[PDB]
Amino acid sequence: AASGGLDRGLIAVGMGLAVGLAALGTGVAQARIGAAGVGAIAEDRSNFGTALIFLLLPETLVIFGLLIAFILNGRL
Amino acid sequence: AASGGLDRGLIAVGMGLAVGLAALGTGVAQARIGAAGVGAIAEDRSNFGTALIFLLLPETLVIFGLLIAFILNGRL
Amino acid sequence: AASGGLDRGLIAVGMGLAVGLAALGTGVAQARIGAAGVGAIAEDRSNFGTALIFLLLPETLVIFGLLIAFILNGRL
Amino acid sequence: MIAPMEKLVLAGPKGRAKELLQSLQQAGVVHLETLRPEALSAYQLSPEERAELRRWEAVSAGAEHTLSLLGLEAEPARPFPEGLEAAEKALSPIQAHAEGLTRQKQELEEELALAQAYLEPLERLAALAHGLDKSPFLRVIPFLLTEKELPLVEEALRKALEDRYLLAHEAYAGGVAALVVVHRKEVDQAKAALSRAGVAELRLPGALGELPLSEAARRLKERAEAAPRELSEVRQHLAKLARESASTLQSLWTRAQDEVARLKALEELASGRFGFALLGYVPVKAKPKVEEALARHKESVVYNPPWAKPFELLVSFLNTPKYGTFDPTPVVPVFFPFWFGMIVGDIGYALLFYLVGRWLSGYVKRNEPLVIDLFALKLKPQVIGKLVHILNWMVFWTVVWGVIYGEFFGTFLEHLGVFGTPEHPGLIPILIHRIDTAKTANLLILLSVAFGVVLVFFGLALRAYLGLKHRHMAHFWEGVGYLGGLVGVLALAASYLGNLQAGWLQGLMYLGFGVFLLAVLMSRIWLMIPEIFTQAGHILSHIRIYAVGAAGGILAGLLTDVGFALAERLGLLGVLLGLLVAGVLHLLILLLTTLGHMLQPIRLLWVEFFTKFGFYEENGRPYRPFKSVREA
Amino acid sequence: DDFAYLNARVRVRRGTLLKESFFQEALDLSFADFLRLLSETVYGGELAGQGLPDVDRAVLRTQAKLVGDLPRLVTGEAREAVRLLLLRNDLHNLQALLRAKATGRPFEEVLLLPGTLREEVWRQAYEAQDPAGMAQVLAVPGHPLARALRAVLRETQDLARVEALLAKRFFEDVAKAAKGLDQPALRDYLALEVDAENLRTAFKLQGSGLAPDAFFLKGGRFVDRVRFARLMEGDYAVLDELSGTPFSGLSGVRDLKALERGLRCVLLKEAKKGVQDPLGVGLVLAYVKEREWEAVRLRLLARRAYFGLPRAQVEEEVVC
């Protein structure tokens, strides 16, 4: 809380930058694939487990943000 | 927590940035992915429980914002 | 923590650009190539490797960021 | 059925054509080629022979097909004889049983399905109807409508009929089974009125429906009831047939099959002698002697471990000749150190990879589809699973070796071997990393960097042997000449490579070294010399792949460190169990991703493989891709 | 742009159907009744009075006004793609002009389907005497078929062979051309057509079994020169080996008529995939196909009705 020196001041920002930025990347990645994905479900409920698994890898960005937001606070 | 020192102004700005940036990304994500789906739905009524689950994924980004903002302010 | 060294700050800024840019780039790269694929998954569980194989090459970028960050560490 | 002998089929490369040819010919084996252009034009099989083959196909197929409907199988083995007649005869009774029962079972299911479904509407209509399709004086039109329909159907009916009809309904659920009753003569208008509304006279389609609503209703109780029981029998017989006869089905099947291929083999050689492979018909007397040896190049149908197992498979690709330089075979021992060494982890990385290895080499039934791992049971391709049982052991050894690369790596953290840092700590060994900090870190940076360079050197040595010994002069000229540049490269490099340790054991050495480079590129002329630029690009890539294989590697160990050890705040103690909230979680995620790292060894390798450093592929080019070669 | 508009224009356009039940009635409709049924439907808007030539003519115009309008719009990527479809049938028409031109048969009796090039191009081409000149005319506005015709014409000036070698060569041009988009669905359907054309051609030519490739049009994706060849050798077992391939209703079929039916169903199933395909060409494509499929049944059933011909006579062929 309160005043902070230059490290704390720099990190305080970046806790926010981190949370906003990851979300943005995740969304864009999701938009192209997500648009593509749906017809297959209609056809195949059977493959749906495969589909459920299919979307996942870019989404990783958000989780990194919570650990780092946690880490920053305390050098803050 | 209200007015204070050098650290706080920096978290207050970036607290907002966290929310704004994620919101844009989620919206963009919904627009492409969302657009393909309705015809599929038109055919597959069948999918409807699935439909509640399918749309759901970009939207996590928003939730991520409320914890970081709350904990930041509305908790400091 | 606290008031960061004048030096620490110069490198600390640039530390972010590497992680954010590469991470974003990988997700998007994976997304377009990812988008093309889906009929094949359905068709051939065995052939699945090709779309998948596609994704691996972009994967190098983020890792590059970690290497430059590594040399800096203990100065940051 | 040909003249006596068992037909033998081989195909292979040009070298094996010869070795093979000699091996069949001397004993008293017959109708051998390539040994003349087509004296098998004077071994053209008869139409009769083609016919026998044809029969064998009916039988062969019949067994497969019948096995399918029956719901069991058989799989291809090594050929054997029975006589065609015996097999056909064998195939026939069973095919007839299984087939009849399979249909019956299907029918039974349908009987049950429809009858139960229909049971309720026919009953509702019947209860209302008190018999009226019995009568001709009154005619009744049953129809089902939902109550969505009811005011509209009623208006259409009303409009045609007035009050000269009875509209009654008793519900079926979500609608009402309805009757429009009309007098004789009113029938035509009555059907049309429902049709306009969009409803229509409803009963079951076909013969059953015509029966009184009451009668149909009775039948529905009976069919629904009867059918599962009856189904049990038909299914039982079928199951029973599959169970008993499966071996048999297979034996006929195998027998037949061996003929179908065998006969075909004869026909083609008959016809037009093929080429680099080798045919023949080999007697009963001749037959083993030729087969035992094989020299490792062909494909037939008759009638410590860490170093050897995948390495054994590269031996087969050594033996083929079709060009003038050494065959592509080095890859498996190039792979191995790094394969083991990718895992160079710490507490949660390398040292936890074990759990998996004993599961896979062993059998794990823990899994929803994996049971005994020897049996390849999977929601993904089963077939694919069986072959790499061999691999489960070699992977288990990899898992064991990666664990070892945890303590040598861990030298430059803790342990003893080149450093002195505590042989073992007390709390969490690898609390944080020596390597995260720069000096230790730096040594690792420089460490990958060299390794990409090393794979390049091996390639250009091979390149010069290739163009030399294949007499691809353009390529020869290229492999030696390109090496001319290098001394100058080392010159420039040194002032940054040790920074202070070097830079001045060489200098403007480049100016004469660059000339040495280009001399013979220019001797061939080569109207496309600039193109050497791309040969230089690979070097940077080789480096990058190793670097990443390392860095992503290092990252893996460090997630156990921010996942179990130290991170949060400036780095504190209780983070150990604050992180344990996370701690169980990081482990599995980590596992998934490191699999991504090992495709990088191969990515590196792929750089080398199609870069004409002792290779036949060059974006195709007669020979099977390398893709297929290395996998087990 | 403009497939915002196109799919949407199509979305409205898809409504003027003459339902499956139309055709079911028609089995049981006399010609007069068939005609009456038609006059009340969109084909009825091009039907004046009663009579088969009028039904058929009504069909041309009905397809024309809802689809034939479209080739003048050529501007979107998609429009060009659509242009390719139309060009192929038209390619037939062009052949009809070429052949007409050769036998002293006049220009005047060759109806063309809605053309990318106008009446006058055709007229000029006809009027442009040398086979080079006719071909040169078609090229004046631009026509990949013009150039192809020329490409074939460069070696000789033998009309029938030019047409034959051209058809293969053109479908070969098409293979690249369809690849030159992307908007897969047309491409996919077309790919199935390659396979289908190979099957029928091999069929037409079966028992000939010569040098198969002169008749094997390339672009087989489940079919190959040898399978084609085998069928052309008379080996029907090819269709039994072309099972589990995308073309399952052909299995065990031994007549071209039923063959064409199965193929139509397979391809139709592919055409049917488009119903809300965006820039993806499916929604317009499927729509064209609907109009087509409708037309097929109408004309068939019109005759059936006309001559009072059996329900069973049309029964295989007015369903897929």
Author numbering:
A (entry chain X), B (entry chain W), C (entry chain Y): 5 to 80
D (entry chain N): 1 to 303, 323 to 651
E (entry chain M): 3 to 322
What does the paper say about this structure?
The a-subunit is connected to the A3B3 stator in the V1 domain by two peripheral EG stalks which form a peripheral stator apparatus (A3B3E2G2a1). In addition, the dodecamer c ring composed of two transmembrane α-helices, the d-subunit and the DF shaft constitute the central rotor complex (D1F1d1c12), which rotates relative to the surrounding stator apparatus.
The position of the central rotor DF-subunit in the three different states corresponding to each state is in good agreement with the 120° steps taken during the catalytic cycle of V1. Similar densities were also assigned as ADP in the map of state2 and state3 in the nucleotide binding sites, albeit the densities were less obvious in state3. Superimposition of the d-subunit in state of V/A-ATPase reveals that the orientation of the C-terminal helix of the D-subunit is very similar, but a large movement is observed in state3 relative to that of state1 and state2. In state3 of the V/A-ATPase, the two EG stalks slightly pull the V1 region, resulting in a minor tilt of the coiled-coil of the D-subunit relative to the d-subunit. This distortion is due to the asymmetric arrangement of the two EG stalks relative to the three-fold pseudo symmetry in V1, and is likely contributing to the instability of state3 in the V/A-ATPase.
